[model samples]
Target chain A: MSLPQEMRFVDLKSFGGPDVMVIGKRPLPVAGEGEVLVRAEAIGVNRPDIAQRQGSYPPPKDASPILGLELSGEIVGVGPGVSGYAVGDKVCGLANGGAYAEYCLLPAGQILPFPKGYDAVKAAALPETFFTVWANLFQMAGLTEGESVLIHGGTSGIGTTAIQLARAFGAEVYATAGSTGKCEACERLGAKRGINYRSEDFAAVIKAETGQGVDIILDMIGAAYFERNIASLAKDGCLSIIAFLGGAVAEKVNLSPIMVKRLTVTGSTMRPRTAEEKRAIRDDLLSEVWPLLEAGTVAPVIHKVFAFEDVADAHRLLEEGSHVGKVMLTV
Target chain B: LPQEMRFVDLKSFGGPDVMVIGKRPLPVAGEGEVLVRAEAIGVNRPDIAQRQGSYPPPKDASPILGLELSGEIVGVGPYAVGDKVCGLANGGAYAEYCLLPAGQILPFPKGYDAVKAAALPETFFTVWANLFQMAGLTEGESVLIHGGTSGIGTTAIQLARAFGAEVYATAACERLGAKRGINYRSEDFAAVIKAETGQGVDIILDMIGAAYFERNIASLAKDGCLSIIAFLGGAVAEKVNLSPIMVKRLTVTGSTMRPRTAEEKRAIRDDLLSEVWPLLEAGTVAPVIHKVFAFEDVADAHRLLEKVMLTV
Candidate 1:
């Protein structure tokens, strides 16, 4: 199989905000043992990568620093001990924090063959969102059929994915967005109620809508919303925090409500998980979520796709917050 | 078993310093039950109940008020001899002794039986069913047993870790060795755990309950579980936000251990026999005996339990 001798990538010039993202070129990634060299077609842009660029989100032990979480690409070369795919197989995976590249080494299990008839740009979007939804909202939160789930930042990548996935599984969905338009967009993604944080209080709105609070809430906003989030939980309600966008550090975490309601509190970062665990999560996404994607019940809500040269511009788009959903990058 | 006798009844209840440990008459074991002569007994915090006079043990078993004890087979109507076991069924383990069912009679897995094994069942059954069965500690997962140097905490750390978990635990301000406790005084558990493992823990066997409730949740990895075995910290927490559990799929459950019925106790005993008995047989899981007082020196044993032993 032929591989590219050179590769283009977006590197961080320094620890700063969105401006730190810059386009650069380097030698094409070589496939080590049990590694596959992927020629990336498109990359999934996530907030964690943004934080990594700004130097706030550090990778766990033995994680990549390439500033991308998911990608769709063609296998250019399979290293020794690699199998189950040809050189040209199109695939997507939850990368170890480095997918915004012309080529990257994907350990054998992290990559899943792209679903039949799925395009590269759209296939690129599924890994991060699906893995987050599966690992956090479903597996961890235990959002089985018939429970109600609240998704904070509903117009974001994780929000829309959670809404559709929850609805597909027969669970009721409620979402909170920063604006009325964002809330409306969340509704289009199958949310039962689109709560506009700008105008209406979601805690009150959800309580009014369901005549009780949602059973599970997928929260990314941190300390700022902690108090209200607890007040919004139903008895035995679970609140799963995947991010601390507002802040992770808080003063005096009040635990009284948690006891009376018998709540379960837990958290995890996906990048640190072993490759085998990632593979199981990929399999889970395929068996449970891929069908819905292929059936068009849950489609990727791509905000915009930018050329590789303007990768920085893609960051600008996300920062502007004008986009309704996930912004992507194509090489 | 004789019926006509005065049982040591608590007139009031308050603290362990209060209970009048006196003679309690033996009660008859009902159908599907067996009465055993008391050979050894277990002393637990629930003895605080007799002191409090609230007497919250349970209804059916013994009108008398003891949670667990171990005794010799005096007359096994439906059972055999030397079935060395300890269970939650017997009424007056604190007194001379009490009765149990044939189902609850488990031959002591470790060499210790009767008096020595009395302390085994309560902590063992409580931890196994909750941490292994309910919380689901798979091999290589981690758990933080709060108040790690205590009876339950010590048992939990060894059992959970031996069963394949990377165990972390917390003890009081005083320094406790790694074997006895995780020594939280020197170790900032949250930071140390993250530094050691790069993430929060997988499970927590918490005795501090509401006091450590929030940190317990925060210290969990995604999909981590916190199983509340007791409320030594204070039963009523001022405020608890469980958003972390939903995010991580955490599970929390607590119960008054001694109150579980005979069938439940039997089921727990069966689990112990299957899962933990081998560990005991292999000496991988041996009982941590802090002190052994003469049966007549019952008050001394209670004092031993109360003093927080500083030595091995």
Candidate 2:
């Protein structure tokens, strides 16, 4: 696949901005047990990538020191005890690390064959957001039919995916976006209403809409939304915090509602989940969600595609927050 | 022999004197509820709050001021007429007849009297819920019960020890099986907890809220849970560091029993019947009733406080 000598990857020439990432060559990584070596055709850019490059989020020790998390590629070599995959089977999956490189090695247990009639770009965009939304909103929070959900960031990759899947699964969906267009797009993807966080308050709208409040909230904006988020949940509701973009610690918080309404506030990061946990998520995706994708009932929403060499532009587009869905990079 | 029934009505929301005997039509059993003719009614602090207008019954509940009672089923749903039962009530327990959710009723334990049975519902339900169900307190773990001389604490201490957990208390509780007791007036509980457990207790069953918030956080071991059952001290934790919640992987959560759904109440009732009722039947634990009062002395009933009971 390579000269067997080195593989080209994105190296942080020093952490600063999108510009700090430069293409460089490093020794090709070999697959360990139940792992597969992939000849990457496409890579997906996510918010955590931006945080890492800006020198904030650090990769877990023992993970690939490389920059990426999701990718689509053809398997070139299978490691010990692996089956059901052979050289040249196209697959896409979430990586523990090392998805930004030309030859990325990933756990086969975490990979799935490309959804029917999908290409590398579309398939590559599926892993990170899909795994995240399914795990947090559906699995951990135990979202069920007829429950109402309020998703923040209704136009980003995570937001778009959450809006569609939650709606498709029969939840009454409400989302928040900065602009009118993003709000409109959210409704188009099946949100009952997309409230503009600029002028209107989501809590007031949710109160008027349901009279009570939504059953669950998938949050990214942390402390700024904490008190209001608590205010916006129905009795026995949950607030699933994934990212703390607003702030982690609130200066003052009234947790009185938790006792009043029996609310649960908890969160987890997808990267740290054990191999078995990731595989369990992958197993659910294959059985429950892959069918939805295959039927085109729900599909990856691609915002823009950039060449591998234009990786800096890819990160720029995600940072500027103008894109609606996923941003992809063709290797 | 008349359709009219007497209840202690709040003449106005203020002090205990506002409560006076009044006449009302008896409540009928509707849906999954039963009409229980009260023999004795148990009083709680919340009853005092409701009488003072600080706590209003959910619109559908009775305006009468009682949260628990022991009685005979006068009108039936799940149970037949004249069944002896005691339960956490929606409201109206101060009346001659209180309509209670059937899911909240439990049989009087063997050799229990109306006064003791009436004291069982409120404290037992609240403790079983917050300490065991919510906090998931299991065998071999340790717990610190605040207000150990009170109804909720006395119930909590017995259940914690009964479940094989190591128990500690802030007030009078060594008799109830706590391994350690901290003098609440003189000592620092957090420092006591750390010094005694070395790693601190696994859970803190607290009623004191913001006043103890910071100290409670410091008193927990890694992965410890703070289960707040009341906010007697205060609710707002002003300018406190919540970083321990993340670093120590702690869970901060709590709930009150009144608002829990019918099915949830039934599940807890089922748990008590199946898991803890045997302990009661065996006399390993029983309610600690402080004093008894006649229904006419409802004002004095509030003066003493498992809890003061008003016999009809």
Candidate 3:
């Protein structure tokens, strides 16, 4: 199997908006030590991509300045010291940056074989959201069986994954969304109740429903929801923040509840995590969650997909924030 | 044994003027109780809180105003009498005699007089539980104490250092042996912490609730903990940003000393007896008493406490 000398990728001319992303040609990336070259079939669009395109988030100095974070395809090249993966293996993984190209290079430890019946699109959607939700919600916050969780942004890719995973693991899940339609979608995906944030205050709703607030909350709204989020936690509950979509600076907030209720508040971003840390998360997913995906007990919810040439349109759809699940680009 | 005892009682809730001498029948030892004949009683800020009617004594606790005392067991319901002991009183340490639960008693550390032994129980128990037990602060960690001159803060500095931790302290004014006290009035404690430690401290003992809430949160390293024991500045925190708590994976927790159960207090007492008593015996740790007052001049003690005081 001969590889092409050049591969198509999305390049940002100058950081601005979705319009900056355009089809361009780049010399094929080679596998480095402990890395693999993946022939990209499907790539997932994520929130950080928007932040990077707007120049607010800069890729690490050594990472490729491309536009995607995860992808699914066949492994075409395995670098020295790599094990358990070889040429022609179907895999999906979190990329170091550069999954937008026809072929992407990812550390071998970050990859997982496609679940028994998964296709490239479904497999592509798993890495970014599943790895994040598993790390933050289950591992950091310790959301467990017999506990309850409240997830914000119920219709987003991260929210959908969290709702299903929490329920699959025997947790009672509650989610909040912007519209009633989105709210119903969340409940159908296994949330006990889907709160429409515009109509009801989430803190009040959670209190009314759970009587003592939730055991844990997966939040991304940041400062705007700071007070309400704290108010909505049970004694010894935890709040895990992954993004600051609403705002970052929380002004004049009371923290008495934290001391009084013994609450834990924590969060982390996935891209900056070390390779050893990612490997641990990858291993956990392989042992604990992959079987669920294999048996069809849990799965990704794809809202829309675009041709590789429509990369700009895919970002526009994600930024518009109307989609219920994930936005994907196929190569 | 006398038929009547002299004690300080609140005439009505107000200022220090509300505290006055009152007579009550001497309290007798009940089940698991020790009748301690007071020699030296430690004056603490909680007495002021009770005098102001803001802090209420828990049910079954004495209405009289002291929290700790040094004395001998004149009568014991379950143990032998004549044991020299100093321990935390549920209440009534302000009286000539008070009843201490047997579990709450500790033998006075060797070589300490009554004044020094009386000072040990409240502050030692408070700091031991909050800083070491609840916060899980271990050796090689660092702590920031808000009131380095106050009893609790002083105890915290010594114990944290003795147990192998780095200490940073903030005080309203300069005092000896307070680790170059960061004068909170003239300097920003958060900036001082950052400058001295590079990253922030791992644990912070705070009482200035809302006023320092934001800065306290800012002064914590990743996975740090903030322990609140009182709300000196303001109880109601107005619009505080909580982003750092989650972003930095911090913990916020607290408890009042009086309301804990006897079993819980016993656990703390046992820990202090084992871990800290030797240090006390060797004079490696000593309670700093600003002044001692005779049992009769309790009003003056209350008044002086009103001037500049914080809870133990």
lDDT of 3 by residue, A160-214 (tens): 9999999999999999999999999999999999999999898989989999999
Writing each residue's lDDT as its tens digit, candidate 1 over B154-177 gives 777778767766766787312222
How far off is residue A53 in model 1, in Å? 2.2
lDDT of 1 by residue, A1-331 (tens): 4555667788877998777777787887678887887888998888877777788768875866777888898898889888787798999877776688888778887788777678898999888888888988877677888898888989888888888899889998889988878888888888888988988887788778877677988888866777677778886687777788777655545555565455655565677677887888888887888887778888888999988777777888887778776888888
Q: For candidate 3, lDDT tens digit of each residue in B169-219? A: 887222333445787899998898888886798999887777898899899
Query: Could you give the CAPRI-style class of model 1?
Result: incorrect
Model 2 lDDT at residue B69: 92
Q: Score the docking of each candidate (DockQ).
A: 0.15, 0.43, 0.44
Q: Relative to the unseen true structure, what is the C-alpha lDDT of residue A20 in candidate 2, on a scale of 0 to 100?
A: 95
Rank all candidate structures by their TM-score, best first, as comma-separated numbers.
3, 2, 1
Q: After TM-score superposition, what is the CA distance of residue A292 in candidate 2 from its true location, in Å?
A: 1.6
Q: If you score just chain A, what TM-score does every candidate get?
A: 0.96, 0.98, 0.98
Where is the poorest 10-residue window by lDDT in model 1 chain A? A251-260
- Best model per lDDT: 2
Docking class of 2: acceptable
**Ranking of predictions according to DockQ:** 3, 2, 1
Better of 1 and 3 by TM-score: 3
TM-score, chain B, each candidate = 0.84, 0.97, 0.94
Error of 3 at B85 (Å): 3.4
